[PDB]
Design an enzyme around this catalytic site. Structure first.
Site, PDB file in Angstrom:
ATOM      1  N   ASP A  69      31.964  -5.958   8.550  1.00  0.00           N
ATOM      2  CA  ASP A  69      31.881  -4.596   8.349  1.00  0.00           C
ATOM      3  C   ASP A  69      32.195  -4.098   9.822  1.00  0.00           C
ATOM      4  O   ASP A  69      31.981  -3.000   9.866  1.00  0.00           O
ATOM      5  CB  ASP A  69      30.634  -4.222   7.716  1.00  0.00           C
ATOM      6  CG  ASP A  69      29.301  -4.199   8.401  1.00  0.00           C
ATOM      7  OD1 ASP A  69      29.376  -5.017   9.411  1.00  0.00           O
ATOM      8  OD2 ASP A  69      28.193  -3.708   7.841  1.00  0.00           O
ATOM      9  N   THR A  70      32.890  -4.721  10.564  1.00  0.00           N
ATOM     10  CA  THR A  70      33.477  -4.104  11.668  1.00  0.00           C
ATOM     11  C   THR A  70      34.529  -2.968  11.578  1.00  0.00           C
ATOM     12  O   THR A  70      35.438  -3.191  10.586  1.00  0.00           O
ATOM     13  CB  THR A  70      33.976  -4.997  12.791  1.00  0.00           C
ATOM     14  OG1 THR A  70      35.348  -5.485  12.407  1.00  0.00           O
ATOM     15  CG2 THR A  70      32.994  -6.112  12.909  1.00  0.00           C
ATOM     16  N   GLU A  71      34.481  -1.818  12.494  1.00  0.00           N
ATOM     17  CA  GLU A  71      35.641  -0.687  12.155  1.00  0.00           C
ATOM     18  C   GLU A  71      36.859  -1.229  12.236  1.00  0.00           C
ATOM     19  O   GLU A  71      37.839  -0.744  11.523  1.00  0.00           O
ATOM     20  CB  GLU A  71      35.109   0.113  13.333  1.00  0.00           C
ATOM     21  CG  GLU A  71      35.582   1.608  13.085  1.00  0.00           C
ATOM     22  CD  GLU A  71      35.285   2.563  14.351  1.00  0.00           C
ATOM     23  OE1 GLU A  71      34.277   3.423  14.231  1.00  0.00           O
ATOM     24  OE2 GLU A  71      36.151   2.405  15.242  1.00  0.00           O
ATOM     25  N   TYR A  90      47.621 -14.896  13.242  1.00  0.00           N
ATOM     26  CA  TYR A  90      46.188 -14.892  13.407  1.00  0.00           C
ATOM     27  C   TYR A  90      45.599 -16.235  12.983  1.00  0.00           C
ATOM     28  O   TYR A  90      44.754 -16.974  13.937  1.00  0.00           O
ATOM     29  CB  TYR A  90      45.620 -13.866  12.719  1.00  0.00           C
ATOM     30  CG  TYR A  90      44.131 -13.895  13.004  1.00  0.00           C
ATOM     31  CD1 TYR A  90      43.542 -13.251  13.809  1.00  0.00           C
ATOM     32  CD2 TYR A  90      43.192 -14.259  11.790  1.00  0.00           C
ATOM     33  CE1 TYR A  90      42.254 -13.105  14.045  1.00  0.00           C
ATOM     34  CE2 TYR A  90      41.763 -14.339  11.959  1.00  0.00           C
ATOM     35  CZ  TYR A  90      41.325 -13.717  12.741  1.00  0.00           C
ATOM     36  OH  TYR A  90      40.107 -13.578  12.974  1.00  0.00           O
ATOM     37  N   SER A  91      45.882 -16.729  11.986  1.00  0.00           N
ATOM     38  CA  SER A  91      45.606 -18.117  11.305  1.00  0.00           C
ATOM     39  C   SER A  91      46.329 -19.366  12.145  1.00  0.00           C
ATOM     40  O   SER A  91      45.366 -20.231  12.496  1.00  0.00           O
ATOM     41  CB  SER A  91      46.252 -18.459   9.996  1.00  0.00           C
ATOM     42  OG  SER A  91      45.714 -17.703   9.099  1.00  0.00           O
ATOM     43  N   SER A 144      37.525 -17.941  12.199  1.00  0.00           N
ATOM     44  CA  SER A 144      37.603 -17.312  11.212  1.00  0.00           C
ATOM     45  C   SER A 144      37.823 -18.211   9.659  1.00  0.00           C
ATOM     46  O   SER A 144      38.078 -19.205  10.090  1.00  0.00           O
ATOM     47  CB  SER A 144      38.949 -16.375  11.321  1.00  0.00           C
ATOM     48  OG  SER A 144      39.488 -16.069   9.807  1.00  0.00           O
ATOM     49  N   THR A 163      42.624  -7.728  30.725  1.00  0.00           N
ATOM     50  CA  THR A 163      43.367  -8.247  29.683  1.00  0.00           C
ATOM     51  C   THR A 163      43.273  -9.774  29.644  1.00  0.00           C
ATOM     52  O   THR A 163      43.172 -10.374  30.726  1.00  0.00           O
ATOM     53  CB  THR A 163      44.677  -7.796  29.713  1.00  0.00           C
ATOM     54  OG1 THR A 163      45.295  -7.804  28.473  1.00  0.00           O
ATOM     55  CG2 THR A 163      45.711  -8.637  30.505  1.00  0.00           C
TER      56      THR A 163
HETATM   57  N1  LIG Z   1      35.738  -8.856  11.347  1.00  0.00           N
HETATM   58  C1  LIG Z   1      36.124  -9.571  10.876  1.00  0.00           C
HETATM   59  O1  LIG Z   1      36.543  -9.236   9.544  1.00  0.00           O
HETATM   60  C2  LIG Z   1      36.622 -11.096  11.149  1.00  0.00           C
HETATM   61  C3  LIG Z   1      36.771 -12.059  10.454  1.00  0.00           C
HETATM   62  C4  LIG Z   1      36.750 -13.180  10.879  1.00  0.00           C
HETATM   63  C5  LIG Z   1      36.874 -13.571  12.219  1.00  0.00           C
HETATM   64  N2  LIG Z   1      36.592 -12.507  13.035  1.00  0.00           N
HETATM   65  C6  LIG Z   1      36.458 -12.749  14.654  1.00  0.00           C
HETATM   66  O2  LIG Z   1      35.268 -12.179  14.968  1.00  0.00           O
HETATM   67  C7  LIG Z   1      35.572 -12.005  16.486  1.00  0.00           C
HETATM   68  C8  LIG Z   1      35.226 -10.391  16.542  1.00  0.00           C
HETATM   69  O3  LIG Z   1      36.234  -9.399  16.317  1.00  0.00           O
HETATM   70  P1  LIG Z   1      36.121  -8.047  15.693  1.00  0.00           P
HETATM   71  O4  LIG Z   1      37.319  -7.735  14.992  1.00  0.00           O
HETATM   72  O5  LIG Z   1      34.814  -8.001  14.934  1.00  0.00           O
HETATM   73  O6  LIG Z   1      36.165  -7.187  16.986  1.00  0.00           O
HETATM   74  P2  LIG Z   1      37.183  -6.136  17.390  1.00  0.00           P
HETATM   75  O7  LIG Z   1      36.784  -4.429  17.385  1.00  0.00           O
HETATM   76  O8  LIG Z   1      38.722  -6.368  16.883  1.00  0.00           O
HETATM   77  O9  LIG Z   1      37.246  -6.525  18.912  1.00  0.00           O
HETATM   78  C9  LIG Z   1      38.064  -6.812  19.897  1.00  0.00           C
HETATM   79  C10 LIG Z   1      37.751  -7.127  21.105  1.00  0.00           C
HETATM   80  O10 LIG Z   1      38.715  -8.002  22.173  1.00  0.00           O
HETATM   81  C11 LIG Z   1      39.028  -7.004  23.022  1.00  0.00           C
HETATM   82  N3  LIG Z   1      40.446  -7.074  23.067  1.00  0.00           N
HETATM   83  C12 LIG Z   1      41.341  -6.637  22.364  1.00  0.00           C
HETATM   84  N4  LIG Z   1      42.677  -6.961  22.939  1.00  0.00           N
HETATM   85  C13 LIG Z   1      42.327  -7.653  24.004  1.00  0.00           C
HETATM   86  C14 LIG Z   1      43.297  -8.221  25.172  1.00  0.00           C
HETATM   87  N5  LIG Z   1      44.835  -8.148  24.873  1.00  0.00           N
HETATM   88  N6  LIG Z   1      42.874  -8.579  26.061  1.00  0.00           N
HETATM   89  C15 LIG Z   1      41.334  -8.816  26.260  1.00  0.00           C
HETATM   90  N7  LIG Z   1      40.410  -8.356  25.497  1.00  0.00           N
HETATM   91  C16 LIG Z   1      41.002  -7.619  24.270  1.00  0.00           C
HETATM   92  C17 LIG Z   1      38.364  -5.692  22.695  1.00  0.00           C
HETATM   93  O11 LIG Z   1      38.372  -4.266  23.738  1.00  0.00           O
HETATM   94  P3  LIG Z   1      39.581  -3.544  24.194  1.00  0.00           P
HETATM   95  O12 LIG Z   1      40.301  -2.923  22.975  1.00  0.00           O
HETATM   96  O13 LIG Z   1      38.345  -2.540  24.704  1.00  0.00           O
HETATM   97  O14 LIG Z   1      40.274  -4.312  25.051  1.00  0.00           O
HETATM   98  C18 LIG Z   1      37.373  -6.002  21.726  1.00  0.00           C
HETATM   99  O15 LIG Z   1      36.170  -5.881  22.911  1.00  0.00           O
HETATM  100  C19 LIG Z   1      37.041 -12.296  16.843  1.00  0.00           C
HETATM  101  O16 LIG Z   1      37.379 -13.239  17.313  1.00  0.00           O
HETATM  102  C20 LIG Z   1      37.508 -11.996  15.349  1.00  0.00           C
HETATM  103  O17 LIG Z   1      38.580 -13.004  15.234  1.00  0.00           O
HETATM  104  C21 LIG Z   1      36.221 -11.184  12.618  1.00  0.00           C
HETATM  105  C1  LIG Z   2      43.104 -11.420   4.630  1.00  0.00           C
HETATM  106  C2  LIG Z   2      41.690 -11.989   4.810  1.00  0.00           C
HETATM  107  C3  LIG Z   2      41.172 -12.491   3.904  1.00  0.00           C
HETATM  108  C4  LIG Z   2      39.931 -13.240   4.304  1.00  0.00           C
HETATM  109  C5  LIG Z   2      39.231 -13.904   2.999  1.00  0.00           C
HETATM  110  N1  LIG Z   2      39.540 -13.074   5.393  1.00  0.00           N
HETATM  111  N2  LIG Z   2      38.247 -13.530   5.856  1.00  0.00           N
HETATM  112  C6  LIG Z   2      38.305 -13.577   7.232  1.00  0.00           C
HETATM  113  C7  LIG Z   2      39.535 -12.732   7.583  1.00  0.00           C
HETATM  114  C8  LIG Z   2      39.928 -12.439   8.914  1.00  0.00           C
HETATM  115  O1  LIG Z   2      39.177 -12.830   9.848  1.00  0.00           O
HETATM  116  N3  LIG Z   2      40.883 -11.471   9.220  1.00  0.00           N
HETATM  117  C9  LIG Z   2      41.038 -10.788  10.616  1.00  0.00           C
HETATM  118  C10 LIG Z   2      42.276 -10.087  10.384  1.00  0.00           C
HETATM  119  C11 LIG Z   2      42.302  -8.847   9.425  1.00  0.00           C
HETATM  120  C12 LIG Z   2      41.152  -7.838  10.023  1.00  0.00           C
HETATM  121  C13 LIG Z   2      39.805  -8.738   9.808  1.00  0.00           C
HETATM  122  C14 LIG Z   2      39.803  -9.857  10.692  1.00  0.00           C
HETATM  123  C15 LIG Z   2      40.127  -9.356  12.292  1.00  0.00           C
HETATM  124  C16 LIG Z   2      41.295  -8.592  12.277  1.00  0.00           C
HETATM  125  O2  LIG Z   2      41.524  -8.093  13.704  1.00  0.00           O
HETATM  126  C17 LIG Z   2      41.357  -7.405  11.310  1.00  0.00           C
HETATM  127  C18 LIG Z   2      42.527  -9.583  11.876  1.00  0.00           C
HETATM  128  C19 LIG Z   2      40.212 -12.417   6.206  1.00  0.00           C
HETATM  129  N4  LIG Z   2      41.105 -12.019   6.065  1.00  0.00           N
END
Ligand SMILES: NC(=O)c1ccc[n+]([C@@H]2O[C@H](COP(=O)([O-])OP(=O)(O)OC[C@H]3O[C@@H](n4cnc5c(N)ncnc54)[C@H](OP(=O)(O)O)[C@@H]3O)[C@@H](O)[C@H]2O)c1
Ligand SMILES: Cc1cc(C)n2ncc(C(=O)N[C@@H]3[C@@H]4C[C@@H]5C[C@H]3C[C@@](O)(C5)C4)c2n1
Ligand SMILES: NC(=O)c1ccc[n+]([C@@H]2O[C@H](COP(=O)([O-])OP(=O)(O)OC[C@H]3O[C@@H](n4cnc5c(N)ncnc54)[C@H](OP(=O)(O)O)[C@@H]3O)[C@@H](O)[C@H]2O)c1
Ligand SMILES: Cc1cc(C)n2ncc(C(=O)N[C@@H]3[C@@H]4C[C@@H]5C[C@H]3C[C@@](O)(C5)C4)c2n1
EC number: 1.1.1.146
Lengths: 258, 259
Positions: B194-196, B158-159, B145, B67
């Site tokens: 497109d992450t789950e 988050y922001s 982000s 963690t």
């Molecule tokens: N995908 C988007 O829409 C989006 C948009 C903008 C920015 N981002 C950024 O992209 C990056 C990747 O995120 P994602 O959403 O693609 O992946 P995700 O599936 O949300 O991955 C989260 C990762 O962090 C670990 N994690 C969660 N809680 C934790 C904790 N308290 N301590 C340690 N590790 C922890 C998870 O593993 P466990 O659950 O196995 O611990 C997993 O490996 C992040 O920095 C996210 O902010 C994503």
């Molecule tokens: C609402 C909104 C609008 C726009 C345009 N964007 N652009 C990037 C993100 C973003 O980073 N949001 C996060 C939030 C929500 C989702 C996706 C991502 C990781 C997560 O864990 C799960 C927490 C976003 N959100």
């Protein structure tokens, strides 16, 4: 468009008012009328401010001393402040933990302290104030900095906390619009202010440019009263034009579509 | 200008790699024949990633579970990671505490948790990594982000943490330039991927068309390798031009010139 008549009899809270901008804000609010409650750690200093406030003609002046390092105090404060005034219509969050211009070495303690006092505290306070502010259709005024919008070396943890305020408050503002919560969120961007704290802090860098606290303070209150999104205050017109970001506004509205 | 040949043999940490972008990053790096240390809380999931990494042709793949809520974990992590690789050439901070799209009511716990995991942790890690990174003249890659640059409802905490990363890292970058610390700070501003995790968080709420994780992941690494300040990645060209903050960059440089 601003009138001092607006503030007369309004229930205002000013954090970090024993000194600096806070003190001049409490002083400004103490004119014509206004119910102002002030907080900081300095017990005696706060009592001094309280007295001069009444002498300046404040409707009611009250202090409650304590650290914003401790979160339970932060809640306790808003309650008592809200008890002393009956209600609360303007919350001015302006306190910060002591910061000095310095290269970031490895003081994780300071990053955490900065985070707790300059950011978390404001959130805790806002949460605590939100019920009282909702029923008065009030305003939250967050006092940020140029470093809360831009990157300056020697203020890493300070910048981190001031950027977090924009992040957080700018976002709950968007939430309050959609959720129709009639509470204003005014973010204040400031440049160097002629406060003693700043003056002590500034060496190497000039120092001579720093703007008057008196004008700065009033400008914050004005923005709050007028329910503006942002308040820009600097010794330069140039920095003032340069600080504003249209692109962000456009992007924020571009997602507001759906 | 980028080449996969660059990454071959480099010692890289990827936090939050049990899934999401982290996992695809570990996967691309794997393909590039680099040394990878991955971390997340999920013990088995991480082992799975570790195996497929070697199958993809990684120079080394190792997992250390835990963690990032606990700060001592975070320091201990970088030490062991460093031990396993000998050195460290690139630190990719990409983990986040679980976030759900929701109106901010009064969850101060979540604001603090968000602050600790998405921000404080990264700082603690950076500090822990800095001696090892200094001697390799490495790179720190902070995954931020759009919400780390702009205000969106349902992501206040988050922001707050993603805006704090910019605040902090953008500033120590300025410090490292003047103090001549030869360590790169890359900030990645991303749109929906497109992450789950995302797809789920956003399935019911307004969906806005997400971008592929595969391309996104590689784009982060590229930026890191090329030692870029910022990396922009979105499903839209329009948002990509609109994210860039020229006024800020001009103001920051306008002080730089003077001092
Ligand atoms: N995908 C988007 O829409 C989006 C948009 C903008 C920015 N981002 C950024 O992209 C990056 C990747 O995120 P994602 O959403 O693609 O992946 P995700 O599936 O949300 O991955 C989260 C990762 O962090 C670990 N994690 C969660 N809680 C934790 C904790 N308290 N301590 C340690 N590790 C922890 C998870 O593993 P466990 O659950 O196995 O611990 C997993 O490996 C992040 O920095 C996210 O902010 C994503
Ligand atoms: C609402 C909104 C609008 C726009 C345009 N964007 N652009 C990037 C993100 C973003 O980073 N949001 C996060 C939030 C929500 C989702 C996706 C991502 C990781 C997560 O864990 C799960 C927490 C976003 N959100
Ligand atoms: N002047 C500038 O150059 C400048 C630039 C940009 C932004 N600003 C913003 O302006 C605001 C006012 O700054 P200032 O110049 O007036 O600084 P200041 O003189 O340092 O005032 C800080 C205030 O915060 C209080 N405070 C400090 N630690 C506290 C704690 N742990 N608990 C409770 N209160 C605490 C202080 O009282 P005690 O010591 O009595 O606790 C004091 O009343 C700040 O938010 C600052 O970020 C100023
Ligand atoms: C040096 C400088 C130059 C410019 C243009 N700006 N614009 C805004 C700030 C700012 O936020 N100053 C803070 C810093 C430095 C001083 C004064 C105040 C409280 C403190 O603790 C001590 C941390 C700034 N600083």
């Amino acid at each position: 468009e601003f009138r001092p008549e607006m503030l007369q009899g309004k229930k205002v809270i000013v954090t970090g008012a024993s000194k600096g901008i806070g003190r001049e804000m409490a002083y400004h609010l103490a004119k014509m009328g206004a119910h102002v409650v002030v907080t900081a750690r300095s017990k005696e200093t706060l009592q001094k401010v309280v007295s001069h406030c009444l002498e300046l003609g404040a409707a009611s002046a009250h202090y409650i001393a304590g650290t914003m390092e401790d979160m339970t105090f932060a809640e306790q404060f808003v309650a008592q402040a809200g008890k002393l005034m009956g209600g609360l219509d303007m919350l001015i969050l302006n306190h910060i933990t002591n910061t000095s211009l310095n290269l970031f070495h490895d003081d994780i303690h300071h990053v955490r302290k900065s985070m707790e006092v300059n950011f978390l505290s404001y959130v805790v306070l806002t949460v605590a104030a939100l019920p009282m502010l909702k029923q008065s259709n009030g305003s939250i005024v967050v006092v940020s900095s140029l470093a809360g919008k831009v990157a300056y070396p020697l203020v890493a943890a300070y910048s981190a906390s001031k950027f977090a305020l924009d992040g957080f408050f700018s976002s709950i503002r968007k939430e309050y619009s959609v959720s129709r919560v009639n509470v204003s969120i005014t973010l204040c961007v400031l440049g160097l202010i002629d406060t003693e704290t700043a003056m002590k802090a500034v060496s190497g860098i000039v120092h001579m440019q720093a703007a008057p606290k008196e004008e700065c303070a009033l400008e914050i209150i004005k923005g709050g009263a007028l329910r503006q999104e942002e308040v820009y205050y600097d010794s330069s017109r140039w920095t003032t034009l340069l600080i504003r970001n249209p692109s962000r506004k456009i992007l924020e509205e571009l997602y507001s579509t759906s």
